[PDB]
Amino acid sequence: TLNGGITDMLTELANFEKNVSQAIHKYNAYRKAASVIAKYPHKIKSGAEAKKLPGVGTKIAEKIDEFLATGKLRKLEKIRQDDTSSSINFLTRVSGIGPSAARKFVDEGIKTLEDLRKNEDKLNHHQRIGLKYFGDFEKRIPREEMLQMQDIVLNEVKKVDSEYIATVCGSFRRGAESSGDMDVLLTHPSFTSESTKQPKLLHQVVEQLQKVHFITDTLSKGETKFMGVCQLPSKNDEKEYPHRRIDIRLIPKDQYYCGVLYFTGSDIFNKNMRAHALEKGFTINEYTIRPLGVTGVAGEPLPVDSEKDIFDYIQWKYREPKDRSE
DNA sequence: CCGACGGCGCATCAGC
DNA sequence: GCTGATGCGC
DNA sequence: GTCGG
Ligand code: NA
Ligand code: NA
């Protein structure tokens, strides 16, 4: 929090770029700057100081100078008071409502949740679900609840077919104390890249989770990817648990561990690992790890039966998810 | 100076 | 009706 | 907005 004022400012700017100006690359520039500053172990004294950090350029250095000298940023103060812009930025907090929808809603007088609640006919299925669980979705998930959630998912999956293999990834797998949602990767030996997916392997699992009333709503659902809502059972006489976001992806057996590695992260570790792999003559993406010829031509994907197989290929020591913060 | 900044499944729109 | 583009989330 | 070829 040494530079909380600065990081808060950059993050607020980031959101407006993304949600109002629809400049996704500026949104990411601000996030990157906020992150690099968030890790800086010194209270910044000037923009020049910050500019030394990778990601902080001329413009943000200038903004830090204004912030340090006046305690605010005129442009941010102005945008905050802007009725239209602050409303557009806000509505995007609803899952299903992006920059385009938020803009159209505000254009026609729909600026608040209350307004949204009054206009169900103008919201698609996803947006209605997002509105319904607006507050719940913004709540984090204690690891204890994530464990109780994993218990149900693993049990039911095995119940449908003991040959299914399911892994809850994300920061949770790395040991995080809280999570924002639940990411589940699923596979079955019967499903490979060059075989049939028996368009129901995913369906059968989603169905069982709905049957035991764990999954409560569906945002989207196809043959390989499910996105929805779930909720832990409440103990009689206790405030019921908040609804949570859960995604389930069915991945071909031969690409499963590249998927688990990828969705376990962190993002920083993935980049570092991808870099190391390249210098070792290997190209790793979320699906496979392939060899690179001397002319840069990628060969066919290499056999992978575990996360370690991946590490072994790039002569890197297997690292526990708990040690993949970077 | 000026292009990259990940890119793909699903729901829905837009053009035919 | 079918096909490709767009919005969205991740 | 920032970086870099
Ligand atoms: Na810099
Ligand atoms: Na949204």
- CA→C1' distance for A105 and C5 (Å): 22
User: Would the Cβ of A267 be found within 7 angstroms of any atom in strand B?
Assistant: no
Same structural domain, A33 and A117: no
Q: What does the alpha-carbon distance between residue A37 and residue A6 come to, in Å, rounded to a whole number?
A: 8
Q: What are phi and psi of A2, to 5 degrees?
A: -50, -35
Same structural domain, A247 and A183: yes
DSSP H helices, chain A, are 4-19, 24-38, 47-51, 58-70, 74-81, 83-91, 99-107, 113-118, 125-132, 134-137, 143-160, 170-174, 201-211, 256-264, 267-279, 307-313
Q: What does the alpha-carbon distance between residue A31 and residue A34 come to, in Å, rounded to a whole number?
A: 5
Q: Which nucleotides of strand B lie within 7 A of protein CB?
A: 4-6, 9-13
- CA→C1' distance for A98 and C7 (Å): 7
User: Structural domain tally of chain A?
Assistant: 4
Cβ A131 vs Cβ A123: under 8 Å: yes
Catalytic residue among A63, A72, A221, A271: A63
Active site residue A317: no
Strands A215-221 and A225-230: antiparallel
DSSP string, A22-83: --HHHHHHHHHHHHHHHT-SS----HHHHHTSTT--HHHHHHHHHHHHHSS-HHHHHHHH-H
Last residue in a domain, options A60, A82, A104: A82
Q: Which nucleotides of strand D lie within 7 A of protein CB?
A: 1-4
Residues forming a β-bridge with A298: A292
Q: Which helix (H) or strand (E) holds A165?
A: strand A165-168
Q: What does the alpha-carbon distance between residue A301 and residue A291 come to, in Å, rounded to a whole number?
A: 7
Same structural domain, A124 and A75: no
Same structural domain, A144 and A234: yes
Q: Which domain holds residue A1?
A: 1-82
Q: What does the alpha-carbon distance between residue A80 and residue A74 come to, in Å, rounded to a whole number?
A: 10
User: Alpha carbon A128 to chain centroid distance?
Assistant: 21
Under 8 Å CB-to-CB from A222, ≥6 apart: which residues?
A202
Same structural domain, A23 and A2: yes
Q: Which helix (H) or strand (E) holds A220?
A: strand A215-221
Same structural domain, A3 and A113: no
Other CB atoms within 10 A of residue A233 CB: 12
What's the CATH code of the domain at A18? 1.10.150.110
Q: What does the alpha-carbon distance between residue A80 and residue A64 come to, in Å, rounded to a whole number?
A: 18
What the block records as the tokens of A147 is: 């464990």
What the block records as the tokens of A189 is: 């030996």
- CA→C1' distance for A298 and C8 (Å): 32
Same structural domain, A153 and A209: yes
Same structural domain, A225 and A315: no
What's the CATH code of the domain at A114? 1.10.150.20
The resolution of the experimental structure, rounded to one decimal in Å, is 2.0
Same structural domain, A47 and A94: no
Same structural domain, A155 and A218: yes
What's the CATH code of the domain at A311? 3.30.210.10
Last residue in a domain, options A92, A112, A139: A139
Same structural domain, A253 and A159: yes
Residue nearest to nucleotide B4 (CA to C1'): A25
Last residue in a domain, options A61, A82, A103: A82
Same structural domain, A210 and A236: yes
Nucleotide with minimal C1' distance from the CA of A99 is: C7
CA max distance for chain A:
67
